[PDB]
Amino acid sequence: TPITANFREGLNVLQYFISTHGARKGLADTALKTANSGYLTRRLVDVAQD
Amino acid sequence: YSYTEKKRIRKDFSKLPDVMDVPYLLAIQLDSYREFLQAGATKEQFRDVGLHAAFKSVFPIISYSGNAALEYVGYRLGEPAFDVKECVLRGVTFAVPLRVKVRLIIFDRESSNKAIKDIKEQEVYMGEIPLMTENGTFIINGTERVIVSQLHRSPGVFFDHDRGKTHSSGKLLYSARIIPYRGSWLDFEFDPKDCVFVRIDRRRKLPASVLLRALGYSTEEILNAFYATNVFHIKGETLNLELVPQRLRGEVASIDIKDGSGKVIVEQGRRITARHINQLEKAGVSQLEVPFDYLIGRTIAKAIVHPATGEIIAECNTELTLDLLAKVAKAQVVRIETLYTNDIDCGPFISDTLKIDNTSNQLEALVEIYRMMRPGEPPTKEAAETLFGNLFFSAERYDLSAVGRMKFNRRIGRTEIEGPGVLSKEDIIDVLKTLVDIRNGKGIVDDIDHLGNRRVRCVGEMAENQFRVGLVRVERAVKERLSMAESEGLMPQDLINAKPVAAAIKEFFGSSQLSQFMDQNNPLSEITHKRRVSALGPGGLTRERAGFEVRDVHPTHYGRVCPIETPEGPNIGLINSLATYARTNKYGFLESPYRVVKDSLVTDEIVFLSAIEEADHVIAQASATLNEKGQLVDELVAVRHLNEFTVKAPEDVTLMDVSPKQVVSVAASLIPFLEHDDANRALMGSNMQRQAVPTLRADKPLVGTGMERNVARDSGVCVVARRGGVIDSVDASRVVVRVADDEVETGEAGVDIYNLTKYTRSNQNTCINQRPLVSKGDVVARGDILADGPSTDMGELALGQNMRVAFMPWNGFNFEDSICLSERVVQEDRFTTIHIQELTCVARDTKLGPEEITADIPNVGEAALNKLDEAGIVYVGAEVQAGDILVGKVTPKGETQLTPEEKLLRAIFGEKASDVKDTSLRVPTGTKGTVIDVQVFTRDGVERDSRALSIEKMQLDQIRKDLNEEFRIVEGATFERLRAALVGAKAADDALNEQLEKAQAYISDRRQLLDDKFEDKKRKLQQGDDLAPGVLKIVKVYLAIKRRIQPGDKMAGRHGNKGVVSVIMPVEDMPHDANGTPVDIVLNPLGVPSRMNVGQILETHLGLAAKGLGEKINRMLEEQRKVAELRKFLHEIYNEIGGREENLDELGDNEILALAKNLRGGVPMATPVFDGAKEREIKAMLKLADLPESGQMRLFDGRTGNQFERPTTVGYMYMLKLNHLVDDKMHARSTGSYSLVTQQPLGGKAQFGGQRFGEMEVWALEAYGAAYTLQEMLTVKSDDVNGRTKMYKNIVDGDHRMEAGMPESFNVLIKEIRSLGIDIELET
């Protein structure tokens, strides 16, 4: 079942709980990409210095 | 309808009726610690948690080679040392005396009742209890601290399913893990070769046959538990098979089973079907003919020993071969033993593992396990058998709590609710029986993210476990001392030691990650920190090994854990706050309230549902169609059956929510129009309200959520009247109320003194003050608000202030998130805050010469003498700035070794040489403030100086004037009640003389108590404090800094919209309307589409109607209208729109002028988090205030004067101010000090400020063609003693040149690598 209402008409108590699953997963990924991208650029620059 | 609501009424748009009021927001902290104290003294002490449970487990002492038993009679709590206000200034940690009564029972070690010695001695001062305050905060060393809850795994058994990570064998759901409460854990894992393996809490691999042999079971008994036994006999056709119709279901038969006296059943190569299954029950045949080739795949269960042969021809639990039939045929064994086996279902996975290990004897397996835990140890049979039995079968080093025994019976399937703590032999084999059933396809693996498997600890559980680990250390030390000593020679008090007990309490509040500092900025941050529950700490997962399952939300978090409240950063998901209606269960789980729904109507019965029991009932939605009869009139209602969201029929509803706000937390319940914003902005909006600084002027928000009133009462900063009555006298320092004769005792009725605290230094360096809001002659009741604390206005939480806001890009000043401000926001002092800084000085004891604090110091100018007093303390109220000295501290020195350059300087001055240096405390650079208070501390036995007597005298004079004032009130009250009893004097008598004698004895009782309350207070003030060894006198001076708003400050709203002020533009450049009212804050409208927060725009439109209606009420007062006309206008506001309407219950003249003067600055509106007003109701309010319903109006520019082409949106938005001032962020340093090993610039001292040139900064310079710049900031500007000296001289002369030099970071690597024996030819 999808979410019928939108942000203007207002969400329900149960419809707003569904949008939290995708939001928390998005906020949890931006905290991990800062460590993997910073680790990826260190291995590529150590082999292209000479 | 109380008295505090008669001043300000808040209109609410809530359309759903309230069934259950919001409980105490700190009920999880007060009731959790109350069980730890157990102040109730009855005959049967309810022992479920606390120190009383630890005094009953380790109470009996089993003395080795002796007879000494100690019986614990009980404990008694003592009176506190100091008050809550005296402990924060003296630092006594608010300790509580602990007295225990122990009984010494002696015996002759003969197991008889002869020569019994009974000594009863009660030990005093055994330990110190924290004894937290009423708000829930702990006072440790004069600093406020709190104990957050912990969310860890529940003790029990859990089954995991690996995702093919072992050997890529598809899916393996046979990972069994048992986590007990205390002691080592045993885990059962399956090898890729289909072999069971038990794993102790250590890196090792033990077979499953060794675990069964160590318990005492043989190979034949263990084989019967895995597979059932079968019967066989050799009669007729040399054999007879017992055919079971259930075992042959689903098994292909390649043999002939045509037996049955001419009745065929299954032919060769035919798969048995349900039709062939029904053929066997009607016939009832039990014996069939099977060739000897089919029995080869089977195995025996026990050893086959024929009585005629006399020797064992077949071993127990061994596969059958062709030679086994030759031995069994000649023996003619009528009875044949075998085990069950089936390739279709119930595969013998553990049967193959028993033959892999050489577990022949039970004693041989005990020494093999002890060798795995201790390699190279002595192979003793009696020594190893004692350690194994004391690991999983003894009360020592293995304790299973009551919460673990209840959970273990639910997973296994036992009917016993309560079980023993020590694991039994039946419980160890029952886990292996449930593990092999899940592998065959019977059952599923459990989930670790389910709230039914997790447990939320409390402050009372951690204090009891930390006290038990410290009590067992004092119980063990007393056992080794009392057993080797005589009962008459050793005293009962000296037998036990209080050192390990008192040390365990101090280390728990100073070395634990859970016990942390309490941030004190606004009353909203105080309640959020006490309710915040984390998953880290002792006995929990850290930030790195969490992964993604722990950092994710689960559908079982509905009404228990806030899904939207989570601190951003590295720890996302680990820390999550509780819900509003969250309540702990009896075992420790989370429970949420729900309503009882019947088939016909909805009853008013409210029950608290657990986590595991919520999967059966169908939970409906909090908001549904109601036809005023208790029955749902909707065709389809959103329900939840099993952790899923789906629409169901209205005839299947069994439960219903209590309120829509039961999902969000307290911090998230303050964001209006939350249903229109996104879940990402709701998480960031909850953090802007947490880091709010209390301003100088507190203004209530025009739009609220309704929870702003119930959040200030639960906080400890607001003064709540305990006894209702008439306010006799009110002042800015104290509030005195007179208690009525109804709710009072017989004596000392009107005795209540409320002392308001002044500006004190908080934990976050913010001012805290309380202002009175009641006048003399106003009656109050129980629960009324007499005075408000910080960020509080008449009982309502007022974090920031509000102003006129617009939405238009103004010359690019609001580029992405920047905010443009006007001049009226800084001229009216709206965001001006007050900071309180603490500066302390200590007088050490040097080995050269000991000297106390002296004001006379050498090498000082006449400018410091005028400000410094003769004692050595600056006056209270001076403008102390950078370079001014606070106290005078002399430091003795020796061996000056005056250089010839210094001798010439001392001669041109004329003054004599002084060897004493000046190391007095000064103000750091960039800090300016005003002294408001100075506190002194003197050790015991030292002489008081001229400063210790000035403050001490002023304190006792205030207490005496406060005690004499209360004595005058009770004196006149006793005489007034006495004069109102007898008749008037003109021109029985014996009863009136007794009343005069009672009045004379009444004033004598208050007088005798007056000196006792004055003598003990003078005793505490004259008693010195117990400071640390090596200090003589410690002085603390406070500085008050009034930081004004400046460009660069960080300002945000309530919907997660951060911002930095760019330029404070004058009042002429701001866009104004046709009337001439300019706006103060201009925002950026481009942030709405990406950062989807529709509630931010709906708040601006609703805020315009709140201030728009306030102008009509204030203008109506200036026209001197009748009171009957104002009551009609107020009725057109509260009784017009849908929601709560309250009126026609106040006084005509008195209450109308009181509400009109309070609502002249805006009508407060309440908008719930999920029951907000629709768009049709917002436009209806603008029509009443003669405002455009569209919410937009064309504004005139102030610079060019031309009217804008498109209409803009104006209104009033509640803004906040965050603690991100630029005074603590701006830093600059050219030259400073360096270290010794590495000549690098330092940071964190009085003068500091520098940027670390990281490795990623180096790769940015290498990407360019820059070579001289990269070498400059790496060799010359740092790590060069002789390089920086010559470089600084070249800049002053005016010659820009650089020398090569040598980096100091490289010379250290040369000397350190040469000590290892490696040669380095650096010169070459």
Place this chain on the structure above:
Amino acid sequence: VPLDGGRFATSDLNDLYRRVINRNNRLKRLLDLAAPDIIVRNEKRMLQEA
């Protein structure tokens, strides 16, 4: 480096050098005392572990 209160600080390397120096002098003074084989093999291991 001394700090406030008359106290000073010593690095962890000063303790390692002190342990190897005193054990070296205990071996430098046991070269003419006619030490048997039972102790001449253990006193060398005290220096090897340092």
